[PDB]
Amino acid sequence: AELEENMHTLNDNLKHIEKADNAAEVKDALTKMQAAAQDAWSATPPKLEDKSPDSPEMSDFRSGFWELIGQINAALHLAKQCKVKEAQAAAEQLKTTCNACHQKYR
Amino acid sequence: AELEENMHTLNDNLKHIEKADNAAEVKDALTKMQAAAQDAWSATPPKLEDKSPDSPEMSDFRSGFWELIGQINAALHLAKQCKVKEAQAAAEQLKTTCNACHQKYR
Amino acid sequence: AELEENMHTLNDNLKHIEKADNAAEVKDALTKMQAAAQDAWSATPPKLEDKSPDSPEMSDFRSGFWELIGQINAALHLAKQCKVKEAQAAAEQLKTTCNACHQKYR
Amino acid sequence: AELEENMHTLNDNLKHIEKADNAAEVKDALTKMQAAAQDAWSATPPKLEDKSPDSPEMSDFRSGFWELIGQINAALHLAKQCKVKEAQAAAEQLKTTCNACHQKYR
Amino acid sequence: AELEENMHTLNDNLKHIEKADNAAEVKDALTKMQAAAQDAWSATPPKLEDKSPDSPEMSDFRSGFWELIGQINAALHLAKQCKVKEAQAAAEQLKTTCNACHQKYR
Amino acid sequence: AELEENMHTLNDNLKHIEKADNAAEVKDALTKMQAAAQDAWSATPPKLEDKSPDSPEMSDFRSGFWELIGQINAALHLAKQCKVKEAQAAAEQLKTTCNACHQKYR
Ligand code: HEC
Ligand code: HEC
Ligand code: HEC
Ligand code: HEC
Ligand code: HEC
Ligand code: HEC
Ligand SMILES: [Fe+3]
Ligand SMILES: [Fe+3]
Ligand SMILES: [Zn+2]
Ligand SMILES: [Zn+2]
Ligand SMILES: [Zn+2]
Ligand SMILES: [Zn+2]
Ligand SMILES: [Zn+2]
Ligand SMILES: [Zn+2]
Ligand SMILES: [Zn+2]
Ligand SMILES: [Zn+2]
Ligand SMILES: [Zn+2]
Ligand SMILES: [Zn+2]
Ligand SMILES: [Zn+2]
Ligand SMILES: [Zn+2]
Ligand SMILES: [Zn+2]
Ligand SMILES: [Zn+2]
Ligand SMILES: [Zn+2]
C-alpha cells in the first residue's frame, strides 16, 4: 500500500488497542501494525524525495521504523503473555516513536 | 525464522530462479525472497551483537537489505512483464549485494 | 478495516490498474479491490446510522457493493484471459457504480 | 466455492462449535463460518435463478447473510472474551437465521 | 475439513479445470486440489476405521494420495508453462487415481 | 522448500517450544511444525533415491511423517486447552519419532 495508507493502518489499530476489551483484539491489532510498519520501512517519504538512498536521512527514517517494529513486537509479546493492560501501555509508548519521525520527516 | 534460515531461503530460491523454465516459477521464487529479506532486515547478526542499534554498522546492515529488497522487487516487475531471461539476469545481479554484506558482516 | 480505509484501498487500486503495464498488476489490484469491497458491504455508513438494517436504504447500499463486486470479478476474468486493455476499460466502468453510491449515501 | 459447499462448511463448523472443549476451537470454527458466509452472500440460489438482481427476493437473500454474518461476528467477540459457553449458545441461535432463509429459498 | 469435504473440493475443481478458458483458472483449481489432497492424506476413511495405522491398507490409502498429489503437481507445472490443454489432459488422467482408491476404500 | 529446510524448521520450532513462556508461542511453533511436516511427507530422501515409490521404505518414510503429524496435532490440542507444560512435554516426545526416522533413512 501507499505509505499514507500504512500510516492510516497504524493509527486505526492503535485506537483499537486503546479500546480493546481482551488480549485477542490487542494481538490482532498489533499484528496489523507490524505488517503496516513492514510495508512502510522501505518507502521514501515526500520530504525526502531528493536524497541519496544512503543519505543519513533515509538511514534515519529506516531506523525509526526499525525502532517502531521492535516496540510493536515487544507489546505483542506482552499480549501473548495475556498482560493486556501492560500491552496497552506499551502501545501508548509507541507514539513517542511515531512523533519523533513525524517531527523530522512528516 | 532465524536469520540463517532466511539466508537458506534466499540461497535456495536464487537457485530455483536460475533453473526456472517459466515466469511463474521466477515470480514464486522472488516472492519467497522478498519475504525472507523482510524477515531478515530487522535482525542483528552475530558479528554485530556488541553494537548500538544506531551503530553505523547496524544502519549499514539494514541498508544492505533495503538495497536487496529493491532489487528483488525490480526483478519481480520484469517477471510480471513476462521478461523471464531479463528477470533471471537481474536475479544474478542480486548476488553482488549478498556478497557485499557477507564480506563486511558475515 | 474502517469503511473509509476500504474506500482508500478501492481508490488507490483503481489508479494502479489505470497505470498498469501488465496483466499481473491488474489482477493483483482487482484482487485487493474484491477484498476491500467484501470488507465494506457489511458496514453501515454515517448518513445511514439512523436506519433499520432492513431499511431499503441499507438494502440499497448492499446492492451497490453486490453490483461492484460482480463488476470487479468480471474485470478480473478479463485479466485472467490476458485481455489487459479490456480489463482496464472494465475497471473504468466500475466508477459508475462508485459514483451512484456516493451520490446517494456519501 | 459453490454455494452448496459454503453450506457444508457452515454446517460442519457449527458442529465443531457445539462439541468444542476450548475457546480456540470455537474461534477457529467461527472464522471458517465468516469466510463461508462471505463467499455465499453474493451467490444466486437455484430457486431464485429467474429474478432481477434487484428483486426483493435477492435483496432478502442477501439480508439473510448480512444478519448471519453479524451474528457470527458477535459470537466470535464472545469467544475472544473467553466466554466459551456464551459463544456456543450464540452459535446455537444462528440456526434461526439458517432456518429462516432455508424456509424461503432452499 | 472432513474427508468428504476434501472430496467435494477435489470433484468441483476438476470440473472447473475441464471448463477453464485460461491458465490462471487451471492453476487456481489445481492449487485448491493440492490443498484438499494434503488435508485428506492423513485422514482415516470409514471402511478402514478398524485397522492398525501401519495396516497395509492405511499405507495403501496414503500411497494413493501421494500419487494423486504428484500428478496434481505435474499438471500444475504444465499450467505454469502455459500449456493449458496439456494441463487439462493431465487433470483428466488424475481420475484413474481417484477411481482406484474409491474401488478399494470408498 | 527442500526437505532439509523443512528439517531446519522442525528443529528450530522444537527449540522455541522448549523455551516458550506462553501458550501462543507453543501454538505458533507447533503450527509451523505441522506445515513443515506436510511439506516433507511427500519428498524422497537421498538414501532412498533408488527405490520404487511403492517400496516399503518409501511407505515407511511416509508413515513416519504421518505419525509425527498426528503427534504434532495432539500437542497442539493440548496447547489450545492452555495446558502449556503438557504441550511442551508432548513436543519432547516427538523426538522419538524424529530419531526413529533418522536412524533408518538419514
Ligand atoms: C518514520 C519513521 C515514521 C514513523 C515511525 C511513523 N510515521 Fe506516520 N508518517 C510518516 C511520514 C513521513 C508521513 C507523511 C506521509 C505523507 O504522504 O505525507 C506520515 C504520515 C502519517 C499520518 C497522516 C497520513 C495522511 O493522511 O497524510 C498518520 C495518521 C500517521 N503518520 C500515523 C502514524 C502512527 C500512528 C505511527 C506510529 C504508530 C506512525 N505514523 C509512525 C513517517 C512515520
Ligand atoms: C546483509 C545485509 C546480508 C545480505 C544482503 C545477505 N546476507 Fe546472507 N548472511 C548475512 C549474514 C550476517 C550471515 C551470517 C548469519 C549467521 O548466523 O552467521 C549470512 C549468512 C548467509 C548464508 C549461510 C547461512 C548458514 O548456514 O550459516 C547464506 C547461504 C547466505 N547468507 C546467503 C545469502 C544470499 C543468497 C543473499 C542474497 C540473495 C544474502 N545472503 C544476502 C548477511 C546478509
Ligand atoms: C456504496 C455502495 C459505495 C460504493 C459502491 C463505493 N463507495 Fe466509496 N464511499 C461510500 C461511502 C458511504 C463513503 C463515505 C464513508 C465515510 O466515512 O464518510 C465513501 C467514501 C469514499 C471515499 C472517501 C473516503 C474518505 O477519505 O472519507 C473514497 C475515495 C471512495 N469512497 C472511493 C470509492 C471507489 C473508488 C469506489 C468504487 C471503485 C467506491 N468508493 C465505491 C460508499 C460507497
Ligand atoms: C440464505 C440467506 C441462507 C442462509 C443464511 C443459510 N443458508 Fe443454507 N442454504 C441456502 C440455500 C439457498 C441452500 C440451497 C443451495 C442449493 O444448491 O440447493 C442451502 C443449503 C444448505 C444445506 C444443504 C446443502 C446441500 O448439500 O444441498 C445445508 C447443510 C445448509 N444450507 C446449511 C446452512 C447452515 C448451517 C446455515 C447457518 C449457519 C445456513 N445454511 C445458512 C441458503 C441459506
Ligand atoms: C484414496 C486414496 C482416495 C483418493 C485418491 C480420492 N478419493 Fe474420493 N473418496 C475416498 C474415500 C475413502 C471416500 C469415502 C469418504 C466417506 O466419507 O465415505 C471418497 C469419497 C469421494 C466422493 C463422495 C463424497 C461424499 O459426498 O460422500 C467424491 C465426490 C470423491 N471422493 C471424489 C474424488 C476425486 C475427484 C478424487 C481425485 C481427483 C478423489 N476423490 C480421490 C478416497 C479417495
Ligand atoms: C522421516 C520420516 C523423518 C522424520 C519424521 C524427521 N526427519 Fe529429520 N531428516 C530426515 C531425513 C531423511 C533427513 C536427511 C535429509 C538430507 O537432505 O540429508 C533429515 C534431516 C534432518 C536434519 C539435518 C538437516 C541438514 O542440515 O542436513 C535435522 C536437523 C532434522 N532432520 C530434524 C528433524 C526433527 C527435529 C524432526 C522431528 C520433530 C525430524 N527431523 C523428523 C527424515 C525425517
Ligand atoms: Fe488465549
Ligand atoms: Fe501469465
Ligand atoms: Zn497502491
Ligand atoms: Zn471487543
Ligand atoms: Zn525460530
Ligand atoms: Zn535452513
Ligand atoms: Zn519448471
Ligand atoms: Zn479498525
Ligand atoms: Zn487510508
Ligand atoms: Zn509495472
Ligand atoms: Zn467451484
Ligand atoms: Zn478439542
Ligand atoms: Zn470439520
Ligand atoms: Zn461439501
Ligand atoms: Zn473463465
Ligand atoms: Zn527450493
Ligand atoms: Zn516469550
Side-chain angles (χ1 to χ4, degrees):
Chain A
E2 311 302 331
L3 178 67
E4 70 184 315
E5 293 308 317
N6 292 330
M7 290 307 155
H8 302 170
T9 298
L10 288 169
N11 197 216
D12 286 11
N13 278 287
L14 267 188
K15 287 178 202 106
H16 285 305
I17 293 164
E18 167 108 8
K19 73 184 182 231
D21 56 277
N22 58 71
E25 289 165 358
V26 174
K27 298 174 193 198
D28 294 344
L30 287 167
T31 296
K32 292 175 184 140
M33 294 187 73
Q34 175 156 21
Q38 292 283 357
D39 196 21
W41 77 262
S42 62
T44 61
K47 291 193 172 187
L48 297 192
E49 279 167 10
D50 307 319
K51 316 289 285 169
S52 161
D54 275 313
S55 63
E57 290 99 339
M58 275 293 149
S59 182
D60 189 55
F61 179 90
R62 267 199 296 294
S63 177
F65 280 113
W66 187 80
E67 183 171 1
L68 191 76
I69 286 158
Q71 294 173 294
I72 290 168
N73 293 332
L76 184 58
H77 191 260
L78 289 167
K80 290 181 188 164
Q81 296 177 330
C82 302
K83 297 165 175 166
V84 175
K85 293 291 161 48
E86 298 188 36
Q88 290 174 308
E92 286 171 6
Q93 294 287 332
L94 298 177
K95 292 180 191 189
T96 296
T97 306
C98 315
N99 283 347
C101 188
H102 293 166
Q103 182 68 240
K104 294 183 290 221
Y105 303 121
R106 182 170 73 179
Chain B
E2 311 302 331
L3 178 67
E4 70 184 315
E5 293 308 317
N6 292 330
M7 290 307 155
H8 302 170
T9 298
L10 288 169
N11 197 216
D12 286 11
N13 278 287
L14 267 188
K15 287 178 202 106
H16 285 305
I17 293 164
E18 167 108 8
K19 73 184 182 231
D21 56 277
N22 58 71
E25 289 165 358
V26 174
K27 298 174 193 198
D28 294 344
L30 287 167
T31 296
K32 292 175 184 140
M33 294 187 73
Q34 175 156 21
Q38 292 283 357
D39 196 21
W41 77 262
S42 62
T44 61
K47 291 193 172 187
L48 297 192
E49 279 167 10
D50 307 319
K51 316 289 285 169
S52 161
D54 275 313
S55 63
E57 290 99 339
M58 275 293 149
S59 182
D60 189 55
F61 179 90
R62 267 199 296 294
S63 177
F65 280 113
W66 187 80
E67 183 171 1
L68 191 76
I69 286 158
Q71 294 173 294
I72 290 168
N73 293 332
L76 184 58
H77 191 260
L78 289 167
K80 290 181 188 164
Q81 296 177 330
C82 302
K83 297 165 175 166
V84 175
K85 293 291 161 48
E86 298 188 36
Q88 290 174 308
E92 286 171 6
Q93 294 287 332
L94 298 177
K95 292 180 191 189
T96 296
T97 306
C98 315
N99 283 347
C101 188
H102 293 166
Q103 182 68 240
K104 294 183 290 221
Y105 303 121
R106 182 170 73 179
Chain C
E2 311 302 331
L3 178 67
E4 70 184 315
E5 293 308 317
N6 292 330
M7 290 307 155
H8 302 170
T9 298
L10 288 169
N11 197 216
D12 286 11
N13 278 287
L14 267 188
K15 287 178 202 106
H16 285 305
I17 293 164
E18 167 108 8
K19 73 184 182 231
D21 56 277
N22 58 71
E25 289 165 358
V26 174
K27 298 174 193 198
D28 294 344
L30 287 167
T31 296
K32 292 175 184 140
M33 294 187 73
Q34 175 156 21
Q38 292 283 357
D39 196 21
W41 77 262
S42 62
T44 61
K47 291 193 172 187
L48 297 192
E49 279 167 10
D50 307 319
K51 316 289 285 169
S52 161
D54 275 313
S55 63
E57 290 99 339
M58 275 293 149
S59 182
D60 189 55
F61 179 90
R62 267 199 296 294
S63 177
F65 280 113
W66 187 80
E67 183 171 1
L68 191 76
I69 286 158
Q71 294 173 294
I72 290 168
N73 293 332
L76 184 58
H77 191 260
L78 289 167
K80 290 181 188 164
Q81 296 177 330
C82 302
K83 297 165 175 166
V84 175
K85 293 291 161 48
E86 298 188 36
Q88 290 174 308
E92 286 171 6
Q93 294 287 332
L94 298 177
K95 292 180 191 189
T96 296
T97 306
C98 315
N99 283 347
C101 188
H102 293 166
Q103 182 68 240
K104 294 183 290 221
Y105 303 121
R106 182 170 73 179
Chain D
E2 311 302 331
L3 178 67
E4 70 184 315
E5 293 308 317
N6 292 330
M7 290 307 155
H8 302 170
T9 298
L10 288 169
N11 197 216
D12 286 11
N13 278 287
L14 267 188
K15 287 178 202 106
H16 285 305
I17 293 164
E18 167 108 8
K19 73 184 182 231
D21 56 277
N22 58 71
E25 289 165 358
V26 174
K27 298 174 193 198
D28 294 344
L30 287 167
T31 296
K32 292 175 184 140
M33 294 187 73
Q34 175 156 21
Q38 292 283 357
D39 196 21
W41 77 262
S42 62
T44 61
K47 291 193 172 187
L48 297 192
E49 279 167 10
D50 307 319
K51 316 289 285 169
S52 161
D54 275 313
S55 63
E57 290 99 339
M58 275 293 149
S59 182
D60 189 55
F61 179 90
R62 267 199 296 294
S63 177
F65 280 113
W66 187 80
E67 183 171 1
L68 191 76
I69 286 158
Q71 294 173 294
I72 290 168
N73 293 332
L76 184 58
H77 191 260
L78 289 167
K80 290 181 188 164
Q81 296 177 330
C82 302
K83 297 165 175 166
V84 175
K85 293 291 161 48
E86 298 188 36
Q88 290 174 308
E92 286 171 6
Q93 294 287 332
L94 298 177
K95 292 180 191 189
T96 296
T97 306
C98 315
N99 283 347
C101 188
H102 293 166
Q103 182 68 240
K104 294 183 290 221
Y105 303 121
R106 182 170 73 179
Chain E
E2 311 302 331
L3 178 67
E4 70 184 315
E5 293 308 317
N6 292 330
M7 290 307 155
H8 302 170
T9 298
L10 288 169
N11 197 216
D12 286 11
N13 278 287
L14 267 188
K15 287 178 202 106
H16 285 305
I17 293 164
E18 167 108 8
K19 73 184 182 231
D21 56 277
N22 58 71
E25 289 165 358
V26 174
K27 298 174 193 198
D28 294 344
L30 287 167
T31 296
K32 292 175 184 140
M33 294 187 73
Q34 175 156 21
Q38 292 283 357
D39 196 21
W41 77 262
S42 62
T44 61
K47 291 193 172 187
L48 297 192
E49 279 167 10
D50 307 319
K51 316 289 285 169
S52 161
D54 275 313
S55 63
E57 290 99 339
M58 275 293 149
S59 182
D60 189 55
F61 179 90
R62 267 199 296 294
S63 177
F65 280 113
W66 187 80
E67 183 171 1
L68 191 76
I69 286 158
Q71 294 173 294
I72 290 168
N73 293 332
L76 184 58
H77 191 260
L78 289 167
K80 290 181 188 164
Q81 296 177 330
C82 302
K83 297 165 175 166
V84 175
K85 293 291 161 48
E86 298 188 36
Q88 290 174 308
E92 286 171 6
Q93 294 287 332
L94 298 177
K95 292 180 191 189
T96 296
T97 306
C98 315
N99 283 347
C101 188
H102 293 166
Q103 182 68 240
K104 294 183 290 221
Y105 303 121
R106 182 170 73 179
Chain F
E2 311 302 331
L3 178 67
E4 70 184 315
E5 293 308 317
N6 292 330
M7 290 307 155
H8 302 170
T9 298
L10 288 169
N11 197 216
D12 286 11
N13 278 287
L14 267 188
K15 287 178 202 106
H16 285 305
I17 293 164
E18 167 108 8
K19 73 184 182 231
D21 56 277
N22 58 71
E25 289 165 358
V26 174
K27 298 174 193 198
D28 294 344
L30 287 167
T31 296
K32 292 175 184 140
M33 294 187 73
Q34 175 156 21
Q38 292 283 357
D39 196 21
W41 77 262
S42 62
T44 61
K47 291 193 172 187
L48 297 192
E49 279 167 10
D50 307 319
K51 316 289 285 169
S52 161
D54 275 313
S55 63
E57 290 99 339
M58 275 293 149
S59 182
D60 189 55
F61 179 90
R62 267 199 296 294
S63 177
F65 280 113
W66 187 80
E67 183 171 1
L68 191 76
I69 286 158
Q71 294 173 294
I72 290 168
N73 293 332
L76 184 58
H77 191 260
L78 289 167
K80 290 181 188 164
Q81 296 177 330
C82 302
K83 297 165 175 166
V84 175
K85 293 291 161 48
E86 298 188 36
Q88 290 174 308
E92 286 171 6
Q93 294 287 332
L94 298 177
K95 292 180 191 189
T96 296
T97 306
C98 315
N99 283 347
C101 188
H102 293 166
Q103 182 68 240
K104 294 183 290 221
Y105 303 121
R106 182 170 73 179

